[PDB]
């Protein structure tokens, strides 16, 4: 989906790099670590810059792990994470990039939106939608849907994967619901509202069958009950929206199926408050009334979610890509300035230390 | 006085060995979830915490999964959410992870506190970081979570004196010739009652000694 | 004698003989023994009713105020005594115990009525 200009690596490969052998830097990190001393962010940056083979990716993974488990783990710079992902893509090691991304706790890989897009798009080009979905879920876990390009790509991948999925688990319900709610809330169009409705339906099914803690625990989701209520509020908002905004028939069908299936440990809620299981029949009545209202107002779209997301992508991804490329070049310039500052600083300490030593 | 130098030598050696053999957070605040005992000491946790220890997350169990260890994010607590209806949370400013932890799920944190909707001026160290009581506010929920309208906090401005003490105040007043009929009265405006669960100063708190 | 930390507290030191208690209200370091060294004796409390059916409590109120203003804490029985004297508000636990006794006696009366 992303153009060649977006995924082009020429500008990254044109960055200024100090050439080192990875063996030498690895040995210096090894000594610093056995002495229980801190390692600089510059040292790991140099090590990740100088990966030159597929085995050097394996070694750089290990040294990323050790830097994460060192006193200066917080100082891992963003250009280093971007370069790590670039190297993994360059030497045919997308599996290693994905492994470090899913185990981000152990390796500290927290990509920016451009780097998520690069990885997700590589997987899409190789038609590896399972791994692309894994990258989508990692985007959701990090709440990195601030850039419209990421939102559009994630929605495309999610709807593609959902079109061909029948046997369907509750952890998968939770993940898909969160991954469709987060980008959906940021899109003020039919895709966004349909995604909101579908994701709320899935999360409400999870809440009703498995409990609310199964929804919010270790997720970027709220701990308040009423996800099905929120789906119905999406329907009500669409009923009062401009002409352009509509709702896909497929999302409505999913919500109806969830309600029809639902109506056929510590207590976290106050005993004065009404439970959701005791509100399901009113949810049915509201769903039917609102479905009739939307059908009367002609606010039901017949195009599938995947096709309609496809046209939305074809309509907006180019502009989003242009914006992302501009920001990316700005980031490269700033990263270059910061790296030269770090190099100057360490050269200064080495010179001062030698001056002290000659005394 | 015969000098006692062995005592001084022992004190200095003990101090040096304690500041070189410091136990880390990953060791001190680890917990065996099956028995709910600290492996470092073997002491069992109190009963009223058991369920939470099996259900809730420590603060850095949340922060280790976030870029920059979640600086600037809002973190609330389950106990606050149950106890109070007004928003209570910390806005993080500085995090010092315990690198020795396998999952980087131990360490210290600093931030600005909002308790029952009232925000503090300065950022201070956060207490109970090692408790299994912490929740992370989603980014898309913060606007809804932080919303708070300060209600009129008009409490009693003054209270009567205790009977005998009031009687003595009045009797002394009459003895000194003053004939005022105004009741003796205790000002309680400057005595602000802090809730018992308000965060305390983590900087003043101690630490378990290695052994 | 230097204690590690500690503070002054106004409390009851027990004297008298077996089956005949008597109390001296004293201000003392909290770490000191119950009947040991004290800073000043601030009163007395005879818990046994006398020939007039009275429990006699003497309170050196000037010195009690002085020691409270010097940073002295109070033991819970001393707070309850000062509440009974009207010097302090009635302690919450006295009110709660009174309510509990009221409920227990109401239950007993209801048992009598039921029988």
């Amino acid at each position: 989906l992303l153009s060649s200009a977006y995924v082009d690596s020429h500008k990254w490969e044109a960055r200024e790099k100090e050439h080192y052998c990875l063996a030498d830097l690895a040995s210096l990190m090894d000594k610093t670590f056995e002495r229980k001393l801190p390692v600089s962010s510059l040292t790991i940056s140099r090590l990740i810059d100088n990966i030159s083979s597929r085995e050097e990716i394996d070694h750089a993974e290990y040294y990323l792990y050790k830097f994460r488990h060192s006193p200066n783990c917080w100082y891992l710079r963003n250009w280093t994470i971007h370069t790590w992902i670039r190297q993994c893509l360059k030497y045919d090691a997308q599996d290693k990039a994905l492994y470090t991304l899913v185990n981000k706790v152990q390796y500290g890989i927290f990509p920016d939106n451009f780097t998520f897009n690069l990885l997700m798009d590589s997987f899409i080009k190789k038609e590896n939608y399972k791994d692309a979905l894994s990258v989508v879920f990692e985007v959701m876990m990090q709440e990195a849907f601030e850039v419209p390009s990421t939102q559009l790509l994630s929605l495309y991948v999610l709807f593609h994967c959902l079109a061909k999925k029948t046997d369907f688990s509750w952890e998968e319900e939770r993940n898909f619901g969160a991954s469709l709610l987060l980008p959906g809330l940021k899109q003020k169009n039919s895709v966004g509202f349909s995604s909101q409705l579908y994701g709320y339906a899935l999360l409400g099914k999870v809440e009703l069958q498995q409990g609310l803690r199964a929804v919010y625990h270790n997720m970027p989701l709220i701990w308040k009950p009423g996800y099905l209520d929120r789906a119905l509020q999406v329907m009500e908002k669409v009923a009062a929206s401009p002409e352009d905004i509509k709702l896909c028939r497929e999302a409505l069908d999913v919500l109806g199926a969830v309600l029809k299936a639902l109506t056929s440990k510590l207590v976290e809620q106050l005993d004065i408050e009404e439970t959701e299981q005791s509100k399901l029949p009113q949810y049915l009545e509201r769903f039917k009334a609102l479905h009739s209202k939307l059908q009367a107002l002609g606010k039901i779209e017949s195009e599938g979610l995947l096709s309609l997301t496809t046209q939305l992508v074809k309509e907006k991804l180019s502009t989003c890509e242009a914006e992302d490329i501009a920001t990316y070049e700005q980031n490269l310039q700033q990263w270059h300035l910061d790296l030269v500052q770090l190099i100057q600083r360490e050269q200064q300490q080495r010179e001062q230390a030698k001056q002290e030593y000659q005394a | 006085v015969r000098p006692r130098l062995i005592a001084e030598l022992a004190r200095r050696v003990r101090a040096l060995r304690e500041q070189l053999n410091r136990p880390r957070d990953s060791q001190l605040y680890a917990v065996d979830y099956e028995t709910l005992t600290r492996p470092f000491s073997g002491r069992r946790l109190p009963v009223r915490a058991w369920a939470d220890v099996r259900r809730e997350s420590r603060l850095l169990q949340l922060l280790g999964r976030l870029p920059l260890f979640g600086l600037g994010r809002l973190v609330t607590r389950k106990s606050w959410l149950w106890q109070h209806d007004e928003p209570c949370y910390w806005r993080l400013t500085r995090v010092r992870p315990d690198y020795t932890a396998q999952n980087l799920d131990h360490g210290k944190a600093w931030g600005i506190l909002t308790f029952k909707g009232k925000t503090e001026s300065e950022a201070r160290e956060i207490e109970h970081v090692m408790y299994h009581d912490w929740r992370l506010v989603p980014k898309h929920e913060e606007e809804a979570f932080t919303a708070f309208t300060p209600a009129p906090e008009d409490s009693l401005a003054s209270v009567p004196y205790p009977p005998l003490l009031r009687a003595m105040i009045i009797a002394e007043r009459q003895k000194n010739g003053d004939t005022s009929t105004e009741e003796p009265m205790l000002n309680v405006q400057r005595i602000r009652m802090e809730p018992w669960d308000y965060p305390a100063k983590q900087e003043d708190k101690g630490r378990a000694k290695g052994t | 004698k230097a204690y590690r930390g500690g503070h002054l507290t106004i409390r009851l030191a027990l004297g008298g003989c077996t089956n005949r208690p008597f109390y001296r209200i004293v201000a003392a370091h909290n770490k000191c023994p119950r009947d040991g060294r004290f800073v000043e004796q601030l009163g007395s409390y005879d818990p046994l009713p006398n020939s007039h059916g009275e429990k006699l409590v003497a309170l050196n109120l000037d010195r009690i105020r002085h020691w409270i203003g010097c940073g002295a804490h109070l033991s819970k029985p001393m707070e309850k005594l000062l509440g009974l004297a009207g010097f302090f508000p009635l302690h919450p636990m006295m009110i709660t115990n009174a309510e509990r006794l009221r409920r227990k006696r109401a239950r007993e009366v209801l048992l009598a009525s039921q029988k």
Partner: peptide, 30 residues
């Protein structure tokens, strides 16, 4: 107390609750 505070306490002390006591007798029972 308000019913909401009582429900909050009943949630806080799940499984370790005793029978809720109403207002006490106004006077000392005889």
């Amino acid at each position: 107390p308000p019913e909401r505070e009582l429900s909050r306490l009943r949630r806080l002390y799940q499984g370790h609750l005793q029978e809720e006591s109403g207002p006490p007798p106004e006077s000392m029972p005889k």
